[PDB]
A paper describes a structure:
By using sub-particle and symmetry expansion in the data processing, the resolution of capsid protein (gp19, 328 aa) has been improved to 3.2 Å, enabling the de novo model building covering nearly all residues (Ala2 to Ser328) unambiguously. The whole capsid of P-SCSP1u is solely composed of 415 copies of major capsid protein (gp19), exhibiting 60 hexameric capsomeres (hexons) and 11 pentameric capsomeres (pentons). Similar to T7 and the MPP-B cyanophage P-SSP7, P-SCSP1u does not have decoration (cement) proteins in the icosahedral capsid. As observed in T7 and two cyanopodoviruses (P-SSP7 and Syn5), each asymmetric unit of the P-SCSP1u capsid consists of one hexon and one subunit of penton, yielding a triangulation (T) number of 7 for P-SCSP1u. Each capsid protein of P-SCSP1u contains four distinct domains from N to C terminus: an extended N terminus (N-arm), a long-extended loop (E-loop), a triangular domain (A-domain) and an elongated protrusion domain (P-domain). Although sharing low sequence similarity with the major capsid protein (gp5, 385 aa) of the bacteriophage HK97, the P-SCSP1u capsid protein gp19 presents the HK97-like fold, which was first determined in phage HK9735 and has been discovered in many tailed phages and herpesviruses. The pentons and hexons are assembled by similar intra-capsomeric interactions, with A-domains constituting the core of capsomers and E-loops wrapping around the adjacent N-arms and P-domains, forming a circulating interaction mode to stabilize the capsomer. The inter-capsomeric interactions are mediated by mutual penetration of the E-loops and P-domains of neighboring capsomers and further reinforced by the extended N-arms interacting with multiple subunits to fasten the adjacent capsomers. Overall, the capsid of P-SCSP1u is assembled via non-covalent interactions to maintain the high internal pressure for DNA packaging. Consistently, the Dali Z-scores revealed that seven capsid protein subunits in the viral asymmetric unit of P-SCSP1u show higher similarities with those of T7. These structural analyses suggest that the capsid of P-SCSP1u is structurally closer to that of T7, rather than two cyanopodoviruses Syn5 and P-SSP7.
Residue numbers in the entry:
A (entry chain G): 56 to 328
B (entry chain C): 2 to 55
C (entry chain C): 111 to 328
D (entry chain D): 56 to 110
E (entry chain D): 165 to 274
The structure:
């Protein structure tokens, strides 16, 4: 799939009696490929179904759907990080991605720096990311920050992020749950924290070294997905039962993810000298 | 001249290749191959049996 | 793509059947002795070319005059074996057909006509209908599994066949059939499967109603 | 624009009891590009038109 | 040189037409709507060959009317737009039309 990108125009003053000629507008595109088919399957014999109490079809279907959703989330998070790590926008008229550094140790790039981060540095990096998002002319609605539980509860105890309930609306609008001066702060377990290798069946670039990652500040347009076939559940009961007594279930889905606008993504990372 | 078009196909208004952002489409017709003439179906004896190995 | 695959499979089956029938006609032509000892057997007509060794150069050097003389010899041989004077045929390939057509004698309306320079066709020589086919036996053939009749021989020097309607017969047991699976095969193998099949057999009935024309050297 | 092409199939013999797997089919395509725009034009005046006795 | 093009006679054209018909037959082409585009010089060189218009064998022609209509199952037409000069690439063309057509005589197509 292709996503065209349109630039911006300019203005001037007119002197009466002269012909107008016109200016040019820059163009670019973003291309997202489609990955292979993702499947989850199970087999149940006839004796076990004869001897059972409850219904196992629905539970298995729910578990398959959950597994597929987890894989989709991990891929989308990796794509958000890759979007944040892009220096140059495909359209020259627009800015690129940014990374915010936290100096925290005297060793090489290691896990001691990641484990040594306190709440004050987290608050400083949050406000720096907010300022950078304001510089990039981003809309005031749907601003989010994703951070893992350890750093989340390190940051919540800080005295600076309290009493800052103002800004855009965004999702999670049911009363008050989570907000700091326009940024909504959420918890997630699917952030990229380990260096990742290539796997067969993936037609996009998901692999990188994420061991220095801490958190992601992003918008709703940093990453996009293209669906070819939606989620679907199947089950065989006609000739499979006769050939070998039992039932088979499959659940499959086809899509692909990619980077759309590197200027809508920011990443916080911890390193040393 | 007297005009400066945007060209809608150049990327970042740089260089040549003004047809880089345009796609190719399906025409609507599939070619396939030809059917060879088969004349030996007739000009010989055809019988039919309901059972047996010969 | 499911509308073109069916056509391709049907065409493939038809082509295989035609090639088998032509091979059986040639084999009937090559049978020296009739299964019944009294009746006569098949006969081949040889176009002598030169003193060269057995090569395809003899096949490539045949002219239209040789083809006309061979056709007349074939008609004589058909009349020797007391065959009826109807439904005689000759199967030839386009190269030899157009080498024959350019010979102006066979299309001269002054003698017997039955042809057309403008339409580029000849229709009858010595009382034998002439047709074109691309499925003549022109290679050497090896035995394959599943063949209960003898189709294999060496057909390297073949030129054409002169035969009748009673030379070769076929027997059918199961007719053509097209099938497609999509009920449970779809979930196990994420895809679709299509088949086409038929059953029959062919054989030699009368060796005396078939003639082979071949080109070789001394 | 693209014109796809489809090749020929094949045949074989079946042994009783076993399973059929399948054969392959050749594929290709042909592409036709679009040229630029051809033009033909003329301009007719009014005085020079009056210097005329036919249309 | 063009000296070879200028030396062609009608017998060569008839032989080439028959060869083209045979090759078309080998390629499993249908038996209807086969055409041959030829320029006036070669057309009137072919008409002067009395065999192709002889009504004794196949006819389909006329010496007085100065025309031939069908040879070896192929229709014959005249055109003044056959490519005969080597062509250079011009701006605005997105296909490949340029070549060296200096040895062209005729075309048989479908």
């Amino acid at each position: 799939a292709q996503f065209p990108i349109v630039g911006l125009s300019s203005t001037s003053y007119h002197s009466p009696g002269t012909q107008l000629t016109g200016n040019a507008i820059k163009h670019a595109e973003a291309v997202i490929n489609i990955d292979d088919k993702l499947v989850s399957n199970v087999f149940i014999a006839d004796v076990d179904e004869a001897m059972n109490h409850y219904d196992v079809r629905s539970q298995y279907s729910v578990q398959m759907g959950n597994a597929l959703a987890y894989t989709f989330d991990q891929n989308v998070a990796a794509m958000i990080a890759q979007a944040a790590r892009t220096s140059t926008n495909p359209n020259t008229d627009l800015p690129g991605g940014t990374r915010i550094k936290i100096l925290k140790s005297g060793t090489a790039n290691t896990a001691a720096a990641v484990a040594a981060v306190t709440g004050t540095d987290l608050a400083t990096a949050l406000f720096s990311a907010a300022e950078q998002m304001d510089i990039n002319n981003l809309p005031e609605e749907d601003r989010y920050c994703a951070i893992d539980p350890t750093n989340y509860y390190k940051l919540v105890q800080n005295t600076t992020v309290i009493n800052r309930d103002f800004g855009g609306r965004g999702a999670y609008a049911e009363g008050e749950v989570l907000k700091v001066a326009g940024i909504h702060i959420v918890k997630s377990n699917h952030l990229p924290k380990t260096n990742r290798s290539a796997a067969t069946g993936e037609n996009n670039t998901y692999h990188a070294n994420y061991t220095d990652n801490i958190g992601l500040v992003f918008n709703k347009q940093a990453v996009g997905t293209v669906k070819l076939m939606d989620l679907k559940m199947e089950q065989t009961g006609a000739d499979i039962h006769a050939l070998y007594q039992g039932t088979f279930m499959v659940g499959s889905m086809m899509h692909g993810s990619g980077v759309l606008r590197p200027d809508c993504a920011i990443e916080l990372y911890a390193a040393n000298s | 001249a007297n005009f400066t078009p945007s060209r809608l196909g150049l990327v970042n208004n740089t260089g040549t290749g003004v047809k880089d952002l345009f796609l190719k489409t399906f025409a609507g017709e599939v070619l396939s191959a030809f059917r060879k003439a088969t004349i030996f179906e007739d000009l010989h004896t055809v019988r039919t049996i309901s059972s047996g190995k010969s």
